[PDB]
Ligand binder design. Sequence first.
Ligand code: F43
Ligand SMILES: C[C@@H](OP(=O)(O)O)[C@H](NC(=O)CCCCCCS)C(=O)O
Ligand SMILES: O=S(=O)(O)CCS
Ligand SMILES: O=S(=O)(O)CCS
Ligand SMILES: [Mg+2]
Ligand SMILES: [Mg+2]
Ligand SMILES: [Mg+2]
Ligand SMILES: [Mg+2]
Ligand SMILES: [Mg+2]
Ligand SMILES: [Mg+2]
Ligand SMILES: [Zn+2]
Lengths: 246, 442, 110, 548, 548
Amino acid sequence: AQYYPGTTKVAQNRRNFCNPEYELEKLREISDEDVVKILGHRAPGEEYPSVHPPLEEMDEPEDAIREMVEPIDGAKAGDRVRYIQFTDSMYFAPAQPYVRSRAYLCRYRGADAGTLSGRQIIETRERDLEKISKELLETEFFDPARSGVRGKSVHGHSLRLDEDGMMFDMLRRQIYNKDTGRVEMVKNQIGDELDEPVDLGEPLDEETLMEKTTIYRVDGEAYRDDVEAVEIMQRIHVLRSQGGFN
Amino acid sequence: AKFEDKVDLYDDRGNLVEEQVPLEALSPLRNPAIKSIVQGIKRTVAVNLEGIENALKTAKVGGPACKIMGRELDLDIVGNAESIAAAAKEMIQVTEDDDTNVELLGGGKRALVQVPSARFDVAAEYSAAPLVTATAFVQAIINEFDVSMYDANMVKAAVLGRYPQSVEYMGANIATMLDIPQKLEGPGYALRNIMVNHVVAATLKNTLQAAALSTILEQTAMFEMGDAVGAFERMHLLGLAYQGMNADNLVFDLVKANGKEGTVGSVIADLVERALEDGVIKVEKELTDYKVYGTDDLAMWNAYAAAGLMAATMVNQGAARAAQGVSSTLLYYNDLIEFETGLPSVDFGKVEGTAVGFSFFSHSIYGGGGPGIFNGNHIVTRHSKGFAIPCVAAAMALDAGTQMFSPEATSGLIKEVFSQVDEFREPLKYVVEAAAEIKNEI
Amino acid sequence: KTAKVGGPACKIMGRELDLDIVGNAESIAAAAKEMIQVTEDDDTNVELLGGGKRALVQVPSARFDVAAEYSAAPLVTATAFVQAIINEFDVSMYDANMVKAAVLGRYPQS
Amino acid sequence: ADKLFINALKKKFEESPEEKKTTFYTLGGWKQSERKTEFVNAGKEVAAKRGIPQYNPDIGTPLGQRVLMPYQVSTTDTYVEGDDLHFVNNAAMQQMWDDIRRTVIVGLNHAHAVIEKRLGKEVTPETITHYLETVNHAMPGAAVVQEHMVETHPALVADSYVKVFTGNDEIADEIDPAFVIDINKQFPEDQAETLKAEVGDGIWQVVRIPTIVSRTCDGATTSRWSAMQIGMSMISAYKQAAGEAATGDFAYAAKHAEVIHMGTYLPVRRARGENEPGGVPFGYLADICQSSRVNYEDPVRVSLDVVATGAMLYDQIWLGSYMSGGVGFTQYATAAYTDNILDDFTYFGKEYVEDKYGLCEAPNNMDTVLDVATEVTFYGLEQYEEYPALLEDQFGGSQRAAVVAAAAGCSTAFATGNAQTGLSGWYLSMYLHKEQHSRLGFYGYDLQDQCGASNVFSIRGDEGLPLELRGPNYPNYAMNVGHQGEYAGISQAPHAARGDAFVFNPLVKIAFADDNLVFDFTNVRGEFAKGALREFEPAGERALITPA
Amino acid sequence: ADKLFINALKKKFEESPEEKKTTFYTLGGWKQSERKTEFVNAGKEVAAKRGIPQYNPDIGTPLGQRVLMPYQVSTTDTYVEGDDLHFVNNAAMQQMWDDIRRTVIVGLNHAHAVIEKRLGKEVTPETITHYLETVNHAMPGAAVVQEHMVETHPALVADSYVKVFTGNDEIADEIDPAFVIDINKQFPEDQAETLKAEVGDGIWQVVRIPTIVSRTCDGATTSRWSAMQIGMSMISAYKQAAGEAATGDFAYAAKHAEVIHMGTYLPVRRARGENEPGGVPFGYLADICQSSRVNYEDPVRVSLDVVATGAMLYDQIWLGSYMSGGVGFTQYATAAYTDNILDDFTYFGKEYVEDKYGLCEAPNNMDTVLDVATEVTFYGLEQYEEYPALLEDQFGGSQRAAVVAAAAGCSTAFATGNAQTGLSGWYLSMYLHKEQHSRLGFYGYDLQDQCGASNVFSIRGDEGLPLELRGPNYPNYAMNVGHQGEYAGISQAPHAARGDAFVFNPLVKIAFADDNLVFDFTNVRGEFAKGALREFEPAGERALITPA
Ligand code: F43
Ligand SMILES: C[C@@H](OP(=O)(O)O)[C@H](NC(=O)CCCCCCS)C(=O)O
Ligand SMILES: O=S(=O)(O)CCS
Ligand SMILES: O=S(=O)(O)CCS
Ligand SMILES: [Mg+2]
Ligand SMILES: [Mg+2]
Ligand SMILES: [Mg+2]
Ligand SMILES: [Mg+2]
Ligand SMILES: [Mg+2]
Ligand SMILES: [Mg+2]
Ligand SMILES: [Zn+2]
């Protein structure tokens, strides 16, 4: 698959996030328990609640499509559908909102992804969400200064950074530690205090942010100079226009 | 034939039934099984005799939480269902051997009623089905019990609700798959105002059958609205065949190849490869490490991409067994395929646009609700001309119990009655058989 | 020709189109009839009146036996005449919406 | 004792009410009236200020060739010129309608179930009180989640809030009393029993959006505004993602699956959304009026307080403005709530029935309709013949047709305990009055009157309905003054005689049992008098945001 | 000179506008704000007086972790917090909608034909003036025929009146000029001649009913109220029987055959009658705004005064309240009429088009769409990248999408002189923006945007329509913020560049050229600033009839 036109670093990074054969760079190590604490849906050692009974308990009629499509593990179990939501700074965060939804529907099964300017969300069955969330938090999808895990009060994608290089957060969930140079998560994604903070590692430096970003800007790579990507967008506009007429 | 195209038709198990069928043998304007389904849905009513009896006994008539103290009437309606239904049938029929059907279900608690086709051929629209059914049952219950002139208006309130003070039959104990003609968003919309959960209930959650019923209703409305007239007719017919009828086994084979481990993106790669293999698209231009595809047949590219969109929904919401992500699949299948190819998405962006607003109105405070309460007449999901709603019916067929407003919640009376009708429950079978029967008349 | 479309006293300056519809009525009506009908020689009728100023149109009964109601008559007739006018004069993509407005009005805003 | 209308007739005219002759033409036209003189002087100042002629007494014909009367508001000692009962000039009447238009009832039952099943979270009296503090901040137009929100001025929206009620005393007693419509406190014991049984363990919100927004906008805004701010307060209070798929089930419940509108939408010729007067059924108007929980030992006072509520809303604001406009229909409605005239007639009929049959003990049949509705019709008509000043007061035939038939129909329903025979009595009164005086109402008054007998007991599609379920959109009733508020009184009459706590919807009845309303629904006629005197304080004004 | 938004960015923040860094969390939350502080105090007073908690700054999350900004109202020197631009807190915004809702245009052409043919009476300027004196007594709610009428207080209904206009100058000059909208006084010469040619010898009334009635009732009351008092005044002034068969032809003509509503009625899911915001087509909204007859030398100023008119009405009152409610949609609309931001982008695009093509001289085709809309889209988006204070000001992506695409679509239409290619440039702007920043608006913002390109030139039943005929009920546009008022600007843009007197209806354009309106439609953004400062005086208040 080709994924996206263009000759910039931004274009290649858009293709790499979509391409499931591309190995996402792992930047930081987070424990399973700390992924669960950041998600905020259940406590460590609490059983997965259910929304319906396990599929093997239900008596379903013959359906060739259900027989051909393997359910994800949390669907077999009857787990709740829960979420994880991220906000990405327009000052060169590595992932950005459409890039996330496009990549999530290439990489992940059974995924409900939503894109907005100030938040981007994925909803799926709980145990599967925990496995995907580890990859979203440990790899280059995430930078702990220019991205935020936020289930409410998302403001900050379009704000000026603070003096530490951190994006604004009305609820201050991610705190930069001047003594380590590392960010700690001190609250879960909905804003409740964690018993113990989670280390999220060091923010990426300016050179590496520029290497990995998928936003176009005049002070990075401008979209108007990626003339092959702009050609394809204008072609889609004209073809949709002509098709709708005759 | 006006069009040269032929398609191969399959059953819901992926077996071939009929090869090389002219496309127009599937048109709602020619196929006699589509005519029988549409006339059937115009004339079918579900009557809840238990519900009428309980509303009378409690005087709970006229809508939610309403009651008139001192109006209670205790009538043994379900105990005398057989005589009440026969008396109703004699007023509903036009002649004794016509196509009137009145059939008791559930020990007499429900009745399936099909008002004679004849009453429709001399009617403007379809409201004779609930109105002739309701008066025949009101009069049969009054006559069964000799209900007095002073009390009979309560039987009317228990059957048809607060109508005509309300515009709808608010509180009625009868149901139809259609809704009143005043609620149409535009003229020609009535076969679109059929809740997704009612199509899923009627087809017993069989994924391919729910997708076929929904597509037959949507694309038949596109003819009634004039969208499928002249330049656009072939696009609509190919959509019906490939997205709703599994033409060429394309939907089935995409799901077979991507069902175990696939994603929306893997289904897209397969569909682009199949379109290239069949000559539907070809490389027009090379940019830097990127092939720009072109087509000399926009309607067929649109049809192939529509079959992929249906497969992608089945793979994505089938894997989660949860219907809510159909709004995301409808968005990103189309957004991804345009940047994958340089060609326009299904319905030239209108599926993608419908999915943007449907995602908002199924994940926000402002209105909408879960996928099952939408329909082709709902303001959020009317915009694509037949290529979006069938995927929502496949997704709801595949949901294992994640919805509060599930078909068991909204559509139990419609399930009990309308799933009895073979052509409503298993339409793919009957429309295929009819297309084979008329294949040499095209 | 006056750009007076969309209801009483309405006009869009600059949108005028000067098309000889009445002078080419025969060809436009034939073209519309071929879209309206379901099969050749069915019960579709398209007849000019008034030296081509008016047309009687009877949409084929069969379209109604597969419809819920009756709006297929104005909607199939409108679109067949809109498409036949555009095709008679090769009206461009940029101007054809004014033919639609002149035939069916301010629908669907109204 | 004097008939009940004698004191008002003695205040209106110098003659005793029995006298047959008077003198006209010597009162100086409009100059006899305080209010007309106010209006002449104000028209001259308006016309000069704006540069366009306006109110001028010398246009058209000269009012006041006869006495321009004062009216007693019935059950009060307040006498006012009729201009002070026009809805434009009476802020109590405008606020009565604003308080209905801005209210919707919204269940918490489906919402609590979405929280327990979909989210796996608990609901308790504690999580409910926390939610009510949140929605009482949000509902008037203030923010709970986003940064950099701009908000309504709290003092402009001080009339908007959310309360709850439930039939479960143990929940209702535990929530802050500030948020609860307490059924045991507001209703006498037997009615409280009946209402708590109908509600059971259900918990319902009564949402009142701001009068300034209802006035800027329309009735169909209320349930949307309500659902937006319930949706925000469910997010804030229950820790959802602020916009996840489960959020949509709270929207659907709040807008569609567990909402009660005050009125349903209307057909295109009289197109209107929900919560407009034409969509409010007669049984809901009777249950909105709160006289039934205060005046329950007097079924005439409860029924006539409902007639006042409905005559004013349905004839003056709805038919006199929404469906027509201009000078309008003040006195078509004042006939039914002034000078104690309908009261005299209805007290006569109640006594006739209580002595002959006993309340609600007459057979529910046509023999009882013929007996009671004819006896009471002849009583009312005889009063106009015996008291020339009464006939000059209710000078239009439509006014007299509505008052006489209201008393006949209410009295028939007090005999049978059933509103449908009360309605047949109302039509029979019309037919008898038309033959007795060789006139009835205005040109078009008895459209519904002549269809009336045949449609009372019909069961056909757009004909058959119990009177409690009919309303201003029942076909025969859609156009004409002098009927709708009286039908709400007939709907109330058998239920007041039975001692029933409500007429058609127990949730509507409880939803107005609330002293935080701006209008006092327990005393509708008292309120009308306060507004006529320019003593009622409405909500909605812009004084705080405009210059001194 | 500086970009037009620089002064406002220097007022809002301490940093220069290009600076990438700032400091948060130090301003005391709400306590930094004069308006929030007024609100906290008022919430305390409201809750204490009524006994129910209300506004409380500690519910939910704490506003003002960042600067709570003032906003410049574009074209003015007025800076206010955005709460002063919420429609509930701004009397000028409420009056702008009341002045549209309470207006209807009603021909006299059929009426004069009925008088000459059926009644056999002559019509002249003198008879027209006598009828206008009569209807300006009657229209606010006063009587001309019957005895013992009760009437509206003239000072509560001072804003109601009837004027006329005609394209025949000598007939115009013979009617009393207190009643005449003088086309040659209100329009510059070339536009006056265009408008008078459209009207010809036709004679039309502009009827404005009372704001207090519009607020009590709804938009569908306006043409009925107008027709009742036109009917009484035709009876009085032409000496009919007061209610004969011919009386019904005046009613049918005033309510149906010669009426122009401001809005058409809506379908049942969003049921509303006539004269509600969703029925007002984009071309009529451009015609109601009067900037075209005052600022005709500057097509950017005319187009963006229409965008301000429509963004406030369609997003704040209509989508943010009638179709939703709560805190609502103030800043989705203010983005299009504050800080001179859309002004800077649209002047750039106008200059670009002037240099490359000349106004109205570009080919009306897709090559012009691709050239202009892409250039202007990249200029706007570069501004947010070059100025971090600009991006933090228009912090929501939907606000940026609406502002950038409005400048691109207006500049495309300045080039082609055709609104349809303007509209195609709006959609291409959204597609380019989405790919540049990997984001566009809120969850649901580009429903119409993705349907957009294919529906611009479609000719199908519910797809195909010139942009001037589309409005908030065009199916793809029926739900979402950030589009409708910008489409009204795009509809105005080509006609301002061509110097056309109107966009879609010349009767609507003349009907608002009238300084007896309460809001000044020649200077919409000036009026919004006057209301934000609490300096605007609305009609419709009840002070005269409530306690001192
Ligand atoms: C709960 C939702 C989901 C929903 O259905 N509506 C919400 C909330 C709702 C509330 C917020 C009021 C409150 O705080 O109590 C109101 C005011 C509507 C109402 N009920 O009165 C609103 N949004 Ni929203 N909403 C807005 C916006 C936005 C932007 C904000 C992005 C940012 O970075 O700040 C994003 C969508 C996007 O990402 O593009 C957004 C989301 C959301 N919007 C998320 C909450 C986001 C969060 O958790 O912080 N709105 C805007 O982009 C600007 C205009 C602004 C609206 C208020 C105004 O116009 O003045 C407000 C319009
Ligand atoms: C979709 C529809 O709601 P329902 O799905 O019918 O509840 C509709 N609301 C809206 O369109 C809300 C639009 C205003 C709020 C969002 C603006 S982006 C309405 O209430 O008629
Ligand atoms: O005289 S009419 O009966 O037409 C009107 C009475 S208000
Ligand atoms: O977050 S959502 O896009 O659903 C609402 C934006 S106001
Ligand atoms: Mg590990
Ligand atoms: Mg190569
Ligand atoms: Mg009180
Ligand atoms: Mg009081
Ligand atoms: Mg350049
Ligand atoms: Mg002025
Ligand atoms: Zn109003």
